Symmetry: D2
Subunit: 282 residues, 4 copies
Amino acid sequence: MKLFRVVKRGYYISYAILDNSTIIRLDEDPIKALMRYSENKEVLGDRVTGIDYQSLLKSFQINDIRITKPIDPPEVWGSGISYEMVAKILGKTIYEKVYDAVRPEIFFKATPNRCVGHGEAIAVRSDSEWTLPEPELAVVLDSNGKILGYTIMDDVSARDLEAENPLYLPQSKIYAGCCAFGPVIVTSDEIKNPYSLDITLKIVREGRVFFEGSVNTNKMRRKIEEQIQYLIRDNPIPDGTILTTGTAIVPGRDKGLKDEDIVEITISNIGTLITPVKKRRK
Amino acid sequence: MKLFRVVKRGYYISYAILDNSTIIRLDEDPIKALMRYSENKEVLGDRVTGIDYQSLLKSFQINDIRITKPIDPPEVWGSGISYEMVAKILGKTIYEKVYDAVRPEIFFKATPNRCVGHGEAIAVRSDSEWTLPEPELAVVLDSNGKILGYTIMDDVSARDLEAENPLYLPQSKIYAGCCAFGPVIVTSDEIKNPYSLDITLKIVREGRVFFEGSVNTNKMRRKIEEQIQYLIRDNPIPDGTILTTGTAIVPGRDKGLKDEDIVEITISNIGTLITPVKKRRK
Amino acid sequence: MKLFRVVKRGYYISYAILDNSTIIRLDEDPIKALMRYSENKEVLGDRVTGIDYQSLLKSFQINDIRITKPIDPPEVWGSGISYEMVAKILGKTIYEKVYDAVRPEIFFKATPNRCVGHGEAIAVRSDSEWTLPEPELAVVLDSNGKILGYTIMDDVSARDLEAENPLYLPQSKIYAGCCAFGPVIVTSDEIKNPYSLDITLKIVREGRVFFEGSVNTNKMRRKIEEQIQYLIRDNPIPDGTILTTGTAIVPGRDKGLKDEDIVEITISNIGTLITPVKKRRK
Amino acid sequence: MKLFRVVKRGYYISYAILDNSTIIRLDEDPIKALMRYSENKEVLGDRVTGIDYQSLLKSFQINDIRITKPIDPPEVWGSGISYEMVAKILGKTIYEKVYDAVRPEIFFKATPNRCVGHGEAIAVRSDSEWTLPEPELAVVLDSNGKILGYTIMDDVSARDLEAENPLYLPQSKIYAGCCAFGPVIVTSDEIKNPYSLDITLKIVREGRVFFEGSVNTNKMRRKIEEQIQYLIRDNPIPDGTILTTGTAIVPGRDKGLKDEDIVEITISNIGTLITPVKKRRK
């Protein structure tokens, strides 16, 4: 099952694609719907025609329906340095110490209103000279830490403020439009092996491929279930929480984002998340 | 006005004390009520007798009413190193670089369900050997960053995990019972000078004053309005957000919290916030 | 307990008077509150001062509080010809046949929005030349038919349309402002004997006692519990239904109501319900 | 447009048939949806397949969907003696006086919870020996009295209690299961001439046509818009009110309903409303 959501005259409607490319309109709340599928694979709703999923992906809007965030995630948490490869602890950089330590990095990324979806604008902080997208695999979680599905997430990071001091990390990570995900949430059975997926980042400036990069999830050192385990320890998370698993694609110092740019992120079996860039006014 | 809230048979009731020690039961939501007072000092409700504010402070519960968090803060943000006085940037420690830099530290502290109030238990992470309370002045904010009132907050911090690596800071700061505040929210006109208040920390173990410390807010280097300014920049905050302003009282390596302890925090004009300690099971 | 309700800035607040003239503000819905008292006589709320019940009765409004209907009755049912003393069945008038028959009269009187309260205007139909108030004792009922309390009701009746044909009875009885009740609902234990109460009707025109009449409930032939029994038979009634028990005070053909009139109805132990009259425009 | 509604796992879903036999699932509340069509004929929703309208009509339930009342009518009002052809006024029977008078009969029939729909059981009062169905054309109304659509209604009447005394009419007309309507609500443009429709009543006992009768609406003396006019005069009605227009098909004294019977009512362009009969236990 692949689940997406549209906004129509100020209200939401959630749809799901079954393997045979038939579209079902959901009776239930999308998060609630994912928990059900996670148990017995039952889907409650009616089969619809006239919903052009393929056009929605390309054109975002058709008539009076517009695609958006597939769900409203109550909490979004991140996890950095999970692939194989200035502030320093006794000679070693903080990043490489965490790479080797038992305890992974876990941080609070976003609230639902700080997130955007397919075809909506991510933002660059008014006071950042160097902001990069971080293309990551992300998981949707229930309150016990059970994986309800997968999606593409863009962990938008004001890399310059982070470099200045690791104590500025929250300011670098949490802001309006700091996070984008979609275009769907694929159920768990739609991905046989999560550690064998291709993630591709493209930044597009005035029709020009300004950056192109790729990495496969088989290069992920720190496994997903360990990230989950450390996230939920003594820490209650609501149903529909998203944990974003980290990035391997890191553009250079010169590849910093700016106004009008287009960030396209592709992951096998999920699709391509396209977000325009809007630079904040001081 | 001094505003508190009780839980009675599974529902909340909000009350407010006017200077002449008369208690008013509120018609409005407490956050909504604070926004009103912030404009024209109007309070909507009826005068009540039989509500023993003074007993509630000492005994927490009377008959079927129990005092709790005065409001449900949609977001709680912290701000460290704001008073005058290992990871390091070119010789200098990360903490002292932020002490001198233009940009203050701002971090996401808690969601409302991760907070507790007067007479409820703060927690120590199951995997922390050294956790300290951080006694701080805290402000209640509207969406524009206007100060709606003041309160006492305990920024409960797993100091050992933080010391190990600054990237563990979120794990050290965000968990169930990681934050406590109360016992009231005092309106802005109840504090003529916020930079002239006495904050006192006491940890009590088996009847014993295990730690006692004090500092006055006139020692606050980084001012409050600057913390607000940096918090809201490109970052939308909901009505009733609490920003906690930082601590000067830091117990030693040997004064780490444990099960059954009592943390009492006193600030002039606000009162005394008392929270028992509960140590988490692995 | 004597329970009343005010409207304050577009919202309701319910209060209750305990025998010792102390006023309690209710935590619960008034209908829900009556069901509780009906079981164990428990009242949930806080004691208030500054609510001037006695002024409210006389002046209707004080500052920003105005007295109104004590509850929103989901259904209002009437019962005619219950005291001892043209359409006709085999010589006898329909009214006198029902007087003698086993089966009492039961009719649907009003929906909640067709009702008004103490100090609000009852109406006369635009097409009625002869409308009279019918001063009656009324009972508040739970879904099983248990008496939750008593009140005063004015069954406002377009007597001329009724006289023309008994099939016009619904049109004579159901309209905007066709019904008024209050000023309180007295709990069941506040009336030792319901069949020993004085009901008094006064119509007041330009300061003038235009009509004065009285009757005692000891003259009630058809008992209340029989009316209840016939009302609920095969007929589900919601909690807080009001059944009005019938009238003995009937003004003459010349005493028909008109614009600006004042209808005052008094019953022992309950009080005096005052409603101005407004004549409808064609 | 022809609009119906199902109950599925404790919740409602509303569908509409467009002339070309395509089924649309509604985004809006059905009453709200009818008001929209009444203005500009716009319908908000998605085209569905797999909803077998024709099976629903015949079998009531398929899988986990069951057809029911097409809407929840806030108020149901009746109107008797509207076709061309003991209590008496000066020699003439009350019924024939109303037949000739300017003022039609209007009565309150039911609340929504006293109504049932296609395939659900109408009831006979436990104390009625002679109850008949009254097959009528019914209109759905907005608050101004504008006709939003048409439906079939069964005005179930305890004819014996009515005959005994016209003051028992409410008891004869208002009870649990006293009213049934459906199976759809047809929009106004689906009926070119409301005064040219065939209404057919069949009572079925153990496979046997126990009664069969028919009449055409061209025999309706008292017109519909006059009934509306008299209904709303000084009397506010909510959106989605149903007014039932009266019957011409009256079975004999021997054709009284009983347990297990099947009442089938057919009207041109609307369909056939089928309701089993359940006799009440004393």
